[PDB]
A paper describes a structure:
The re-acylation is catalyzed by lysophosphatidylcholine acyltransferase (LPCAT) and among the four LPCAT members in human, the LPCAT3 preferentially introduces polyunsaturated acyl onto the sn-2 position of lysophosphatidylcholine, thereby modulating the membrane fluidity and membrane protein functions therein. Combining the x-ray crystallography and the cryo-electron microscopy, we determined the structures of LPCAT3 in apo-, acyl donor-bound, and acyl receptor-bound states. The structural and functional analysis provides the basis for the re-acylation of lysophosphatidylcholine and the substrate preference during the reactions.
Overall, cLPCAT3core crystallized in the monomeric form, and residues 42–459 were resolved in each protomer. The helices in N- and C-wings tilt to converge at the cytoplasmic side and thus form a large cavity embedded in the exoplasmic leaflet of the ER membrane and open to the ER lumen, which is filled with loops and Ha-f. In general, this T-shape chamber is composed of a “horizontal” tunnel parallel to the ER membrane and proximal to the cytoplasmic side, which connects with a “vertical” tunnel at the middle point. The horizontal tunnel extends from the N-wing to the C-wing and its tip in the N-wing ends at a gap between TM1 and 6, which opens laterally to the lipid environment of the ER membrane and thus might represent a potential gate for the chamber (hereafter lateral gate). The T-shape chamber is empty in the crystal structure and the analysis on the Fo-Fc electron map failed to identify any non-proteinous density. This non-contact dimerization might be mediated by those intermediary lipid molecules and the relatively harsh detergents used in the crystallization trial deprived the cLPCAT3 of the lipids bound, resulting in the monomeric biological unit in cLPCAT3 crystals.
Numbering used by the authors: 42 to 145, 152 to 174, 183 to 194, 198 to 230, 237 to 367, 372 to 430, 435 to 489
């Protein structure tokens, strides 16, 4: 039971989560053939009975929490309807219930932060642009089934209700097992990388006084290797989680010009592009493309774009808010990423400095700076506490904070040089 969680290397709860995500596949062996089944109320009943069992198996307490939010949300589907208050109360209540969970390692708030976004998204869908005219829904079991879907429950991607009901019917396409193997084999490849790296390079090492004053160059060097190997826990649990999502048929975006079907519908990653990438505007734009696209659809699209940027990323700090740490992380995308784009336009688009720096002559150095850019930003994540976060930040001479601002004052004068 617990000896399996100690034998490989990972945490005790981490084994119960990987078992839960891998449990998606034998459960997707029923939507293999019983999906073409004429009865649709049986499909909704499968997701509830599986999702409630998955929630109970991982944590006994959560089964009531999610269920309570689900019944209260379809109560705001009866009352209020699409009157504007309904969006205001859903946004507040869901975050009020969510933030209560944090105030009261792998807690029951793991699938709860997912359904919070799934129910807020449902409210705006129940409430136009070419995307909005499609994503909007028309007109009990529907809300319960959509929330408890086994493929995307613990950390899975948000899926449009309109598109979810489609899965019960025609999934909006040919059934396949070959792409499912692709995201599973690549998903397990990163699991081997994580389980082997995590013990010889850990978090508690950053706060440990041992050697944490000796090198300076390796002081930042450890921060480059770490926060590149730690985020692989998310990577493995988004590729194996997509593997079940695509096996059912939900993973299919559509088809292309050659008739070949598309697979990037609920794809929360793009590996060749989130790695081997010199410019991290690609990586940070959307490492969790779905988690990033949701905010870009229901927060940024709904929201004066200049004043929207701060309030949209502030919602991501209301999303968890464990310590000031998670807030300091979202003020990195609105920091280095906006500065990185300024250096992108500094070259090829300036009448002073770009002229000489536009050419092919004017790779490894950029990536080395960009992996450092990630680590420094992931430091106030994992270790979120004020005393832990400040400890390693002051020990590394606060380089990221100084360099970004140093670039920010000098940069507009380089545009003149």
């Amino acid at each position: 039971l617990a000896r399996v969680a100690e034998a490989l290397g990972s945490s005790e709860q981490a084994l119960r989560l990987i078992v839960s995500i891998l449990m998606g596949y034998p459960f997707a062996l029923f939507q293999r053939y019983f999906l073409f089944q004429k009865e649709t109320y049986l499909i909704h009943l499968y997701n509830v009975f599986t999702g409630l069992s998955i929630a109970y198996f991982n944590f006994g307490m959560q089964f009531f929490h999610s269920l309570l939010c689900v019944l209260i949300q379809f109560l705001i589907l009866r009352l209020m309807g699409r009157t504007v208050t309904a969006v205001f109360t859903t946004f507040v209540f869901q975050m009020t219930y969510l933030m209560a969970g944090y105030y009261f390692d792998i807690k029951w708030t793991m699938p709860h932060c997912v359904l919070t976004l799934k129910l807020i998204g449902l409210a705006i869908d129940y409430y136009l642009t070419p995307e909005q005219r499609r994503f909007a829904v028309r007109g009990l079991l529907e809300v319960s089934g959509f929330s408890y879907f086994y493929g995307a429950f613990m950390v899975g991607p948000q899926f449009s209700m309109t598109d979810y009901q489609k899965l019960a019917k025609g999934e909006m396409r040919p059934n396949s097992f070959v792409p499912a193997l692709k995201r599973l084999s690549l998903g397990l490849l990163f699991l081997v990388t994580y389980t082997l790296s995590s013990p010889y390079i850990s978090e508690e090492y950053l706060i440990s006084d041992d050697y944490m004053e000796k090198p300076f160059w390796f002081r930042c060097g450890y921060i480059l290797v770490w926060g590149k190997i730690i985020l692989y826990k998310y990577v493995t649990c988004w590729l194996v989680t997509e593997g079940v999502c695509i096996l059912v048929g939900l993973g299919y975006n559509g088809n292309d010009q050659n008739g070949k079907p598309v697979w990037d519908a609920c794809a929360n990653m793009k590996v060749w592009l989130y790695e081997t990438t010199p410019l991290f505007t690609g990586t940070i734009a959307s490492f969790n493309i779905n988690t990033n696209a949701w905010v870009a659809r229901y927060v940024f699209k709904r929201l004066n774009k200049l004043l929207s940027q701060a309030l949209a990323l502030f919602f991501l700090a209301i999303w968890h808010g464990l310590h000031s740490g998670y807030l300091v992380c979202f003020q990195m995308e609105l920091l280095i990423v906006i500065v990185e784009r300024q250096v992108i336009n500094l070259v090829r688009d300036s009448p002073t400095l770009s002229t000489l720096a536009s050419i092919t002559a004017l790779y490894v150095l950029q990536q080395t700076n960009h992996w450092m850019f990630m680590g420094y930003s992931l430091v106030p994540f994992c270790l979120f506490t004020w005393d832990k976060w400040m400890k390693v930040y002051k020990s590394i001479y606060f380089l990221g904070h100084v360099l970004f601002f140093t670039l920010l004052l000098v940069l507009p004068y380089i545009r003149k040089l």
